[PDB]
Structure 1
Amino acid sequence: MKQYLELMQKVLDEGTQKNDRTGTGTLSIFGHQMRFNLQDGFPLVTTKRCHLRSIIHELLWFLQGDTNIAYLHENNVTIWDEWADENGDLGPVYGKQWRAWPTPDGRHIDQITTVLNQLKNDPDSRRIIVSAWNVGELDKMALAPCHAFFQFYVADGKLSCQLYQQSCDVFLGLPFNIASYALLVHMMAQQCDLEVGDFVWTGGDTHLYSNHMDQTHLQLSREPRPLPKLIIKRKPESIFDYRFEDFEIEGYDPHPGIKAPVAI
């Protein structure tokens, strides 16, 4: 999509040479923000095919507060294998923090429910936040949250949301992230009888890996097709009762996919 391709280009033009923890070089910029009107359609990148299946199962997994890849495996979803240990444990990552942020006094806050209450009983609140950045359990995590902070906003029956991605692989991870959170916005709005507003994406260290240049130029040459339409076949009793089948993407006609290898 336009906003996306615009970023991709910007990174090429303005990105400074920076290396990552693996030794692979990246082109990076710091601080960027793009908006996506959700009424204009589901922000699923078209200039390259994306498989929403993994996306959906991962989101549902998070909402379950599960941090073991078992569920993912039952559905043959392996995007988390790379990090899980022999038992399939990733540590207190996303899911754990969202649904059971542990306090120093023995409690476990359910940030998702907390957020739902607010959207329903105090929509003008300015602190409708979900944070995965738990300083206390960083070490125990398989890896630090790429996207670790998001805020919800209500105005005119429209529910918006801003995500802050402190670190971002523009080519491989960004497309996935945008769709994932966009889907979360819809689920939230559905349970709150609210219309979807804007999904605002903000990033810190936004980069492209040096060995992704050709794929970038190749995609950067395709023309964005119209955005598809996300439809929810039903209205679960809660934000925790959605099932894979409830979602159906409609009108998605992407260009072919583009493989993006990684060094190890």
Structure 2
Amino acid sequence: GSELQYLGQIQHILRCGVRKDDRTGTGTLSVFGMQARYSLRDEFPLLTTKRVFWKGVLEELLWFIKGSTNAKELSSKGVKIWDANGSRDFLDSLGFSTREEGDLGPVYGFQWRHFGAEYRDMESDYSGQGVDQLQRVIDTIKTNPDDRRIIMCAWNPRDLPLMALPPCHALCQFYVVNSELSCQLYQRSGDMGLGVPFNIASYALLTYMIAHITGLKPGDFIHTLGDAHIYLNHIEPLKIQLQREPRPFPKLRILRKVEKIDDFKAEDFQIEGYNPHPTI
């Protein structure tokens, strides 16, 4: 069971994690180096022991694909998860006083579509600039599925300081065998309680999208974590969630045949049968 692996990681962190503070000084139980395999075969890994913000997962990814680094473009979709990091106070705390609100810097969207390009601002035109990693992985999957270099890297040391926040998802690698597309994510830091479930859904979704455009079947989503942690305040709540028997994962349905990654829209996706346990 995929979810069982996730809950297993949580148990392991409770049993073997050690105290480790984050940037704010808040404590967490932490374990370095973890890995879970989530099958994407005939099911979508949207955790059931606790509700995952699906609209956020979907809109954020379409926003990444779009190459946007403007939090306002995601906020207007009803997803505010990046608004704080693009706010005046936050951008100023980073020294980006002349940066317009919403300008997150060269984050995912930019890295994925224009890696290496000289970031100006969120409104700048980068067409033809940088390496379009996303389309490249798609091309490679179609032409040379055996390729062991189908990677999309968001971790750009040069652009790091310009980003409102360093990416938690440094890079992901795709793999194809027997008509199945698999994806492994290297997540440098994961909040098992709140972020990871969302993280998992995001990349499983990216895989489903690429598999659809490349005519492959979703295979496995391998979630690799660097600092896998649990905030101390989620220990008891998590001990409760761990008591809940996971439910069948929902299924993802793509309502139409999409040809290019850029053509996907929120409306083309439908999460069916998602029945998460009641909020804790």
- TM-score of the two chains, using structure 2 as the length reference: 0.89
> Which of the residues 16, 23, 44 maps onto 2:25?
23
2:115 and 2:200 map into 1 onto residues whose CA distance is 24
Deviation at 1:37, TM superposition (A): 1.4
Residue 140 of structure 2 is aligned to residue 118 of structure 1: yes
Counterpart contact for 1:18–1:28, Cα < 8 Å: yes
2:243 and 2:12 map into 1 onto residues whose CA distance is 14
- TM-score of the two chains, using structure 1 as the length reference: 0.94
Moved more, 52-61 or 32-41: 32-41
One-letter amino acid of the counterpart of residue 181, structure 2: L
> Which of the residues 230, 243, 247 maps onto 2:252?
230
1:76 and 1:245 map into 2 onto residues whose CA distance is 14
Residue 220 of structure 2 is aligned to residue 198 of structure 1: yes
2:189 and 2:52 map into 1 onto residues whose CA distance is 21
Deviations along 1:216-254, one digit per CA (max 9) or x if unpaired, are 112111110111111100122310111111111111111
> Which of the residues 21, 34, 37 maps onto 2:36?
34
Task: Quote the residue 1:171 is aligned against.
Answer: 193
Q: Provide the aligned C-alpha RMSD in A.
A: 1.3
Q: Indicate the percent of aligned positions where both proteins have the same amino acid.
A: 54
1:126 and 1:232 map into 2 onto residues whose CA distance is 28
Task: Quote the residue 1:189 is aligned against.
Answer: 211
Which portions of structure 1, spanning 4 or more consecutive aligned residues, are displaced by more than 3 angstroms?
Answer: none
Task: Quote the residue 1:143 is aligned against.
Answer: 165
1:35 and 1:54 map into 2 onto residues whose CA distance is 22
Task: Quote the residue 1:58 is aligned against.
Answer: 60
Counterpart contact for 1:67–1:92, Cα < 8 Å: yes
Deviation at 1:184, TM superposition (A): 0.6
Where 2:29 maps in the other structure, the secondary structure is strand
Structure 1 portions without partners, runs of 5+: 259-264
Where 1:136 maps in the other structure, the secondary structure is coil
2:51 and 2:269 map into 1 onto residues whose CA distance is 18
Structure 2 portions without partners, runs of 5+: 89-100, 119-127
Counterpart contact for 2:72–2:83, Cα < 8 Å: no
Task: Quote the residue 2:233 is aligned against.
Answer: 211
Deviation at 1:214, TM superposition (A): 2.1
Deviation at 1:51, TM superposition (A): 2.4
One-letter amino acid of the counterpart of residue 13, structure 1: R
